[PDB]
Design an enzyme around this catalytic site. Structure first.
Site, mmCIF file in Angstrom:
data_model
loop_
_atom_site.group_PDB
_atom_site.id
_atom_site.type_symbol
_atom_site.label_atom_id
_atom_site.label_comp_id
_atom_site.label_asym_id
_atom_site.label_seq_id
_atom_site.Cartn_x
_atom_site.Cartn_y
_atom_site.Cartn_z
ATOM 1 N N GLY B 22 0.782 -1.288 -0.007
ATOM 2 C CA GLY B 22 -0.144 -0.060 -0.017
ATOM 3 C C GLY B 22 0.916 1.263 -0.094
ATOM 4 N N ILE B 23 0.412 2.162 1.018
ATOM 5 C CA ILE B 23 0.948 3.648 0.890
ATOM 6 C C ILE B 23 2.796 3.615 1.129
ATOM 7 C CG2 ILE B 23 1.336 5.803 2.193
ATOM 8 C CD1 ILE B 23 -1.786 5.420 2.441
ATOM 9 N N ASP B 66 9.507 -6.528 13.200
ATOM 10 C CA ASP B 66 8.003 -5.991 13.740
ATOM 11 C C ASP B 66 8.192 -5.150 14.489
ATOM 12 O OD1 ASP B 66 5.466 -6.093 15.117
ATOM 13 O OD2 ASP B 66 5.611 -8.133 15.522
ATOM 14 N N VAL B 67 7.629 -3.727 14.074
ATOM 15 C CA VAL B 67 7.788 -2.290 14.785
ATOM 16 C C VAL B 67 7.297 -2.467 16.279
ATOM 17 C CG1 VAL B 67 7.497 -1.254 12.200
ATOM 18 C CG2 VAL B 67 5.427 -1.365 13.942
ATOM 19 N N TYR B 159 -8.819 2.269 16.516
ATOM 20 C CA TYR B 159 -8.037 3.251 15.391
ATOM 21 C C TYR B 159 -8.095 4.698 15.616
ATOM 22 C CZ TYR B 159 -6.403 3.699 10.543
ATOM 23 O OH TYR B 159 -5.953 4.389 9.481
ATOM 24 N N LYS B 163 -4.644 6.976 16.204
ATOM 25 C CA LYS B 163 -4.492 8.258 15.310
ATOM 26 C C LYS B 163 -4.384 9.447 16.006
ATOM 27 C CE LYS B 163 -3.169 5.620 11.979
ATOM 28 N NZ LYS B 163 -1.951 5.231 11.316
ATOM 29 N N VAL B 192 -8.207 5.716 0.988
ATOM 30 C CA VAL B 192 -7.162 5.623 0.060
ATOM 31 C C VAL B 192 -7.416 4.023 -0.398
ATOM 32 C CG1 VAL B 192 -4.398 5.610 -0.542
ATOM 33 C CG2 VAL B 192 -5.353 6.913 1.376
ATOM 34 N N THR B 194 -6.075 1.037 -0.907
ATOM 35 C CA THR B 194 -5.121 -0.007 -0.575
ATOM 36 C C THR B 194 -5.474 -1.380 -0.171
ATOM 37 O OG1 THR B 194 -4.654 0.582 1.609
ATOM 38 C CG2 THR B 194 -3.391 1.880 0.040
ATOM 39 N N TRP B 254 -16.245 18.922 5.658
ATOM 40 C CA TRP B 254 -17.652 18.570 5.956
ATOM 41 C C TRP B 254 -18.025 18.275 7.706
ATOM 42 C CZ3 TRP B 254 -19.224 15.774 1.201
ATOM 43 C CH2 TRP B 254 -19.733 16.703 0.304
HETATM 44 N N1 LIG Z 1 -7.374 4.188 3.506
HETATM 45 C C1 LIG Z 1 -5.988 3.954 4.062
HETATM 46 O O1 LIG Z 1 -5.437 3.235 3.240
HETATM 47 C C2 LIG Z 1 -5.429 4.953 4.948
HETATM 48 C C3 LIG Z 1 -6.055 6.288 5.227
HETATM 49 C C4 LIG Z 1 -5.572 6.897 6.335
HETATM 50 C C5 LIG Z 1 -4.467 6.435 6.978
HETATM 51 N N2 LIG Z 1 -3.605 5.208 6.522
HETATM 52 C C6 LIG Z 1 -2.492 4.911 7.304
HETATM 53 O O2 LIG Z 1 -1.396 4.771 6.373
HETATM 54 C C7 LIG Z 1 -0.411 3.684 6.944
HETATM 55 C C8 LIG Z 1 -0.382 2.494 5.980
HETATM 56 O O3 LIG Z 1 -1.375 2.024 5.379
HETATM 57 P P1 LIG Z 1 -1.679 1.352 4.116
HETATM 58 O O4 LIG Z 1 -3.066 1.350 3.735
HETATM 59 O O5 LIG Z 1 -0.419 1.145 3.388
HETATM 60 O O6 LIG Z 1 -1.784 -0.326 4.775
HETATM 61 P P2 LIG Z 1 -1.507 -1.745 4.406
HETATM 62 O O7 LIG Z 1 -2.159 -2.325 5.212
HETATM 63 O O8 LIG Z 1 -1.691 -1.668 2.671
HETATM 64 O O9 LIG Z 1 0.500 -1.513 4.449
HETATM 65 C C9 LIG Z 1 0.644 -1.929 5.710
HETATM 66 C C10 LIG Z 1 2.165 -2.539 5.901
HETATM 67 O O10 LIG Z 1 2.570 -2.501 7.295
HETATM 68 C C11 LIG Z 1 3.038 -3.622 7.626
HETATM 69 N N3 LIG Z 1 3.077 -3.890 9.038
HETATM 70 C C12 LIG Z 1 1.925 -4.239 9.815
HETATM 71 N N4 LIG Z 1 2.305 -4.507 11.106
HETATM 72 C C13 LIG Z 1 3.630 -4.309 11.008
HETATM 73 C C14 LIG Z 1 4.532 -4.261 12.305
HETATM 74 N N5 LIG Z 1 4.136 -4.682 13.370
HETATM 75 N N6 LIG Z 1 5.614 -4.341 11.932
HETATM 76 C C15 LIG Z 1 6.258 -4.059 10.596
HETATM 77 N N7 LIG Z 1 5.445 -3.806 9.723
HETATM 78 C C16 LIG Z 1 4.264 -4.216 9.941
HETATM 79 C C17 LIG Z 1 2.038 -4.695 6.777
HETATM 80 O O11 LIG Z 1 2.846 -5.983 6.355
HETATM 81 C C18 LIG Z 1 1.843 -3.840 5.551
HETATM 82 O O12 LIG Z 1 2.922 -4.039 4.316
HETATM 83 C C19 LIG Z 1 -1.068 3.274 8.159
HETATM 84 O O13 LIG Z 1 -0.767 3.548 9.259
HETATM 85 C C20 LIG Z 1 -2.552 3.400 8.084
HETATM 86 O O14 LIG Z 1 -3.153 3.324 9.260
HETATM 87 C C21 LIG Z 1 -4.357 4.500 5.512
HETATM 88 MG MG LIG Z 2 -17.226 16.390 9.512
#
Ligand SMILES: NC(=O)c1ccc[n+]([C@@H]2O[C@H](COP(=O)([O-])OP(=O)(O)OC[C@H]3O[C@@H](n4cnc5c(N)ncnc54)[C@H](O)[C@@H]3O)[C@@H](O)[C@H]2O)c1
Ligand SMILES: [Mg+2]
Ligand SMILES: NC(=O)c1ccc[n+]([C@@H]2O[C@H](COP(=O)([O-])OP(=O)(O)OC[C@H]3O[C@@H](n4cnc5c(N)ncnc54)[C@H](O)[C@@H]3O)[C@@H](O)[C@H]2O)c1
Ligand SMILES: NC(=O)c1ccc[n+]([C@@H]2O[C@H](COP(=O)([O-])OP(=O)(O)OC[C@H]3O[C@@H](n4cnc5c(N)ncnc54)[C@H](O)[C@@H]3O)[C@@H](O)[C@H]2O)c1
Ligand SMILES: NC(=O)c1ccc[n+]([C@@H]2O[C@H](COP(=O)([O-])OP(=O)(O)OC[C@H]3O[C@@H](n4cnc5c(N)ncnc54)[C@H](O)[C@@H]3O)[C@@H](O)[C@H]2O)c1
Ligand SMILES: [Mg+2]
EC number: 1.1.1.406
Lengths: 254, 254, 254, 254
Positions: B22-23, B66-67, B159, B163, B192, B194, B254
């Site tokens: 993902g991101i 693992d973070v 969550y 955040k 997003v 993902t 909004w």
């Molecule tokens: N809609 C959205 O995708 C969205 C919106 C707002 C914020 N975010 C934030 O952006 C960040 C990344 O999200 P994204 O959609 O790529 O998610 P994703 O699930 O696609 O990617 C998450 C990555 O983090 C890794 N991960 C999870 N736990 C871990 C750990 N303990 N140690 C090491 N790696 C670990 C997973 O293996 C994965 O590769 C997150 O903090 C998420 O909360 C996402």
């Molecule tokens: Mg609002």
């Protein structure tokens, strides 16, 4: 609405965590004065029995429990419900540890997050259950200006992080239970003259910055925070949910 | 003053957690393309080699970690600093779990806070140590619109709180390290497209609400979030610290 | 997305108000460098011809107009559209007057609100018309940390009020035109080393407070604000609308 | 410390603008009932006598005045101070006009800003002069959820901006006067069942959206907003200045 008595809690029962000290105890006073029956919660036995002795007949139960122990909170609610139906919850149990980010030990961080945030969820889940079933209640969380800005000059990144969580937890439960009649709000106090802060007040290289950074130029008194909680927890706040109420002598304006 | 290359990362080495999906992955691509070298970090070994195989020569290391394990982040920083001084950190590792507050297992609450909050602290402390030492660094945290408002209609109170903590953590470390030349900022993305949002995007009783609530009427693209991380991480953002940048298609408007 | 050129404005035409000085002029530089053609707007003739002389061939038109005159803005857009289609608007025209609230003359108040807020609406309506018709555009407003908090020690309640309006105007137009492809965002700068602030910098009983209140301990440079505007006005910010982007050296964190 | 009467206004004299209708009137009722005397101010003479006829002996004066006329507010403060020292001011006079940004007459923009923003400044300067002099005072501004987020689906960009200005104005005067014992706060109500929202509550293509967007699923009652003004205005709120208190049924939570 009858404005004369709309700020009262007659007939109500409030559970207060962190009831043995500081702001938690002053809210017990305020709520007792206002017609509420109490459930005192605190990990510290000595403190609790002092609280209860003073509050007298408004005390329905006094419970020695650590908010980080989630089954103790589930147990406490069950006990509560037998004794008085609990319609108000005040989450005041919290801690604060000074640390530099690069010299933080993992236990300091984990413990602040466990008391300030996890404990608040465990208490809110335990007591909110019966409120959500009745379709009625009020919760007031102790957040901080620290959930909005960062204190100076002292460092406590875990406290700031914890208070950020507190404010958003507040909003998350407010949104989730709004439709089912439970309001949830937070106070975000500035510096308050309680036990949590006396150590920091005795060093002027700190205390001076504090007051110069506060537009009113003084610490708040616990009663000033209590009055705000009283407002949020009473029927006067009936259209107020998910609000973060700053009680900080203007600290966050600058 | 060169505006044509102000957004570049030439000669930098960036560490990205969550690099596997993902991101976090799109960010690596963005940084690779802006001339940076990459330290890739994910608990998923399979996802890491895919990431690394795709990035090519831009990859200086890939570290399975693992973070939530503090001593593994510290070691990972040690390993990474040995390959090249790390001047950028992106904390993208994160999770979401849907749960109703009243029916929440303790373990779900604990684990979302562990990854999203504790893990970002462990990584930020580990990688920021040498940056603080150098008098130079940029950290980009993945916050969320969920640290400012509450999502609907689905429930995920852990969550929202995590955040809230991400945004205040970002600000706390911004304040603590500003004097020693390390900037710390967060993104607050909207929805997003993902892996984290695939299951939920498959459910129109959630999905039609998502878009309706979004002025731009659409999910963001991972690259729209990456472009914004690139800004925060680059010299373009040199007077930006402690900022929470909304990338949410107007959602928080909004 | 191609990250290499995603921050460029090739082919684009930007109208900039307040182009003759300070941040407005540095954004003209940044945008010229980035491939944009320009419409310079400013009430001050001397300043404008200097701007234009320096920016050379990137200048499509140079227009002497007062942003508070709404038909001059309507006229300016019409002129603009003949000469180059304007896809970007930067509202940088603004003023700041020191005053004590109890010693404010009505004209000082009315004038600050007229330049900072009314002028911004008149420009945004004039130029936003053609953007909304094409279903494409970007606007960037100059807000301030003053739209979030209150400066100290100096008083300028009209400036604070005006910047509050600026931030919400930004969000109101972002929400209104989101569906029709026009993004609208604001920068909220801290202290910036331009013409607006030189007078205030020469008094140390002021300048010292300023830096001690700013975590980075310095004023920003106009180029640091320009880079942020460049980001917001470019295709890199394509999922960014209604955002208030703080560029303040952390001033609002504390 | 007396919690049973901390919310009372005994022996105070409060000036309320917009006293003739909706929230301003309910506030007068609330204050009348808490033991205050009233200076009533509205541009509508007819509405004023109705207000005064209903309030009875609590009314010390009624003054027909347009808040946009600075010299009339000053005179009104002079008149009021002559009857009794004014220690509370509520700025409730305000308007809303729906308009599409691209089809906005200059006069509509101007007039909403004149009443909502300029008028609150003129009144606050006039009445705050003697309060600042005394070292004691409370001001309550009527802000709006519209100073934090943007309403949907209807468009009223002038209103959003005016409320942005209301919130920053409140904070600016909080900061300036904190040292001299005058507190200044704003309410940010959600939809309230009043005259200002009657035409729009009659339109289900707006109205069903309003409630849907409100966690509490309902409009507020004028008295729910009044109870909250009473808190801000009373000694209960003695450590609260520069606060923006959401009374919106959770609206700004989502
Ligand atoms: N809609 C959205 O995708 C969205 C919106 C707002 C914020 N975010 C934030 O952006 C960040 C990344 O999200 P994204 O959609 O790529 O998610 P994703 O699930 O696609 O990617 C998450 C990555 O983090 C890794 N991960 C999870 N736990 C871990 C750990 N303990 N140690 C090491 N790696 C670990 C997973 O293996 C994965 O590769 C997150 O903090 C998420 O909360 C996402
Ligand atoms: Mg609002
Ligand atoms: N300046 C201030 O005092 C200030 C400012 C802003 C916010 N707050 C917040 O308001 C709340 C109360 O602080 P205050 O000064 O009274 O604090 P305090 O230390 O005076 O009182 C805290 C109480 O909570 C109890 N406690 C601590 N950990 C506990 C646990 N795990 N389980 C049960 N009880 C526990 C203690 O026994 C004590 O009785 C806290 O959440 C605090 O973070 C305080
Ligand atoms: N410290 C700072 O400089 C700072 C900090 C935060 C926000 N801002 C904001 O960013 C923007 C630019 O300020 P900056 O320092 O360059 O200011 P500046 O005074 O250097 O430049 C302002 C320009 O706007 C022009 N101007 C003023 N009134 C005008 C009018 N009615 N019509 C047309 N042009 C007019 C002036 O001729 C001048 O060229 C302003 O909106 C300001 O409030 C500045
Ligand atoms: N949905 C809501 O009602 C709602 C929500 C949020 C905020 N507010 C704010 O609360 C405040 C009061 O609103 P409310 O619904 O009672 O409105 P209302 O229209 O019922 O009452 C407004 C009063 O102000 C008076 N007034 C208008 N212009 C004036 C002037 N120039 N001089 C003196 N008096 C003047 C009117 O005569 C009227 O009596 C306003 O600022 C409004 O923007 C209302
Ligand atoms: Mg501050």
């Amino acid at each position: 609405m009858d404005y004369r008595t709309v700020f009262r809690l007659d007939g109500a029962c409030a559970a207060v965590t962190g009831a043995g000290s500081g702001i938690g105890l002053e809210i017990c006073r305020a709520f007792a004065a206002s017609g509420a029956r109490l459930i005192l919660i605190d990990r510290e036995a000595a403190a609790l029995d002092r609280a209860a002795q003073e509050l007298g007949a408004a005390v329905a139960a006094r419970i020695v429990a650590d908010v980080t122990d989630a089954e103790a909170m589930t147990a406490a609610a069950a006990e509560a419900e037998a004794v008085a139906p609990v319609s108000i919850l005040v989450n005041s149990a919290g801690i604060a540890r000074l640390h530099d980010a690069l010299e933080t030990d993992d236990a300091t961080w984990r413990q602040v997050m466990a008391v300030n945030v996890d404990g608040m969820f465990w208490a809110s889940r335990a007591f909110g259950r019966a409120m959500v079933a009745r379709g009625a209640g009020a919760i007031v969380n102790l957040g901080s200006m620290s959930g909005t800005i960062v204190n100076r000059p002292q460092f406590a990144s875990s406290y700031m992080a914890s208070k950020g969580a507190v404010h958003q937890l507040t909003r998350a439960l407010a949104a989730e239970w709004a439709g089912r009649g439970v309001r949830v709000n937070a106070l975000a106090p500035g510096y308050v003259a309680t036990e949590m802060t006396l150590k920091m007040r005795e060093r002027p290289e700190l205390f001076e910055t504090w007051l110069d950074m506060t537009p009113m130029g003084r610490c708040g008194e616990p009663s000033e925070i209590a009055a705000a909680a009283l407002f949020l927890a009473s029927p006067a706040a009936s259209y107020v949910t998910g609000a973060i109420l700053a009680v900080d002598g203007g600290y966050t304006v600058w």
